[PDB]
Write a protein that binds this ligand. Structure first.
Ligand SMILES: Cc1ccc(C(=O)Nc2cc(C(F)(F)F)cc(C(F)(F)F)c2)cc1Nc1nc(-c2cccnc2)nc2c1cnn2C
Length: 271
């Protein structure tokens, strides 16, 4: 990671909550997002992992401020924010081609992480940021690791929490997290994109989802979804992780559909 010095940094507004919008001087200045004792340890820790990543579809770490207070993790800024909220907002305005391009981008980033032997564990549209060019980039806001136990509790959460509706069965039952379980999660993300941000298994409780998945049921087709796209998510949801596509097969399959777009034709796109 690169140590940024606080003079090139200007916080401006609180985006969420802390994560600010700011400006980073590079001459020209660029806009950035700024995230600000066990909590301090993990904070600087996560930056070290981010700094190892450099890919078009992975949130880019500009640097960190670890020698001054406030301590800061600085990334590029993603104007359009989190993909799930963004799709619920643009419900219907994108073609299948544009939606499958976002999925391609997401899979490209996930192929890069798998090549690094990095297992995400929380691949979900809420962790995908979007910029003014509709480029999608994998991120991790850390909600899986938010500590809500009492500081004197007899029993504490170990292993963090899992996103039950996004997590492969083997990872739920045996904590076997691999790129293959990320691929399952990627399938859920395809369904999220294609439904413009619907809640997976919206009619079911959490326990009913685990019971549904073990009975062989999966998310239903999205409306207006081309068959090839729904086929691919179904492949992502095979129960035996070894039969799922690799993130390389995925990027490849999406590339073939995009280059032969008649396979992405859905009547709603007809004019
Ligand atoms: C400043 C910052 C710091 C950290 C991360 C991040 O991705 N951490 C991360 C990623 C990975 C990995 F694998 F994906 F690369 C692995 C890990 C692990 F696991 F190691 F910890 C951690 C993201 C940002 N920036 C944003 N975040 C938010 C935001 C909004 C509400 C709540 N939280 C965050 N909004 C933003 C931006 C940019 N624009 N906007 C509108």
């Amino acid at each position: 990671t690169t140590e940024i010095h606080p003079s090139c940094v200007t916080r401006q507004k609180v985006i969420g909550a802390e994560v600010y919008k700011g400006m980073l001087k590079t001459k020209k200045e660029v806009p950035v997002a700024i995230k600000t004792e066990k909590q301090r340890v993990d904070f600087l820790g996560e930056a070290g992992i981010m700094g190892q990543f450099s890919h078009h579809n992975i949130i880019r770490l500009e640097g960190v401020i670890s020698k001054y207070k406030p301590m800061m993790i600085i990334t590029e800024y993603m104007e359009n924010g989190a993909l799930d909220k963004f799709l619920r907002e643009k419900d219907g305005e994108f073609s299948v081609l544009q939606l499958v391009g976002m999925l391609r981008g997401i899979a490209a980033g996930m192929k890069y992480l798998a090549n690094m032997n990095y297992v995400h564990r929380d691949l979900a549209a809420r962790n995908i940021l979007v910029n003014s060019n509709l480029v999608c980039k994998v991120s991790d806001f850390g909600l899986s690791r938010v500590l809500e136990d009492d500081p004197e509790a007899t029993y504490t959460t170990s292993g963090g929490k899992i996103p039950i509706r996004w997590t492969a069965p083997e990872a739920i039952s045996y904590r076997k997290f691999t790129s293959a379980s990320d691929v399952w999660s990627f399938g859920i993300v395809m369904w999220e994109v294609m439904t413009y941000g619907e809640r997976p298994y919206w009619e079911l409780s959490n326990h009913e989802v685990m019971k549904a998945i073990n009975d062989g049921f999966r998310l239903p087709t999205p409306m207006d979804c081309p068959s090839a796209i729904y086929q691919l998510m179904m492949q992502c949801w095979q129960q035996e992780r070894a039969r799922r596509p690799k993130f390389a097969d995925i990027v490849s399959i999406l590339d073939k559909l995009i280059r032969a777009p008649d396979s992405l034709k859905t009547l709603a796109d007809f004019d």
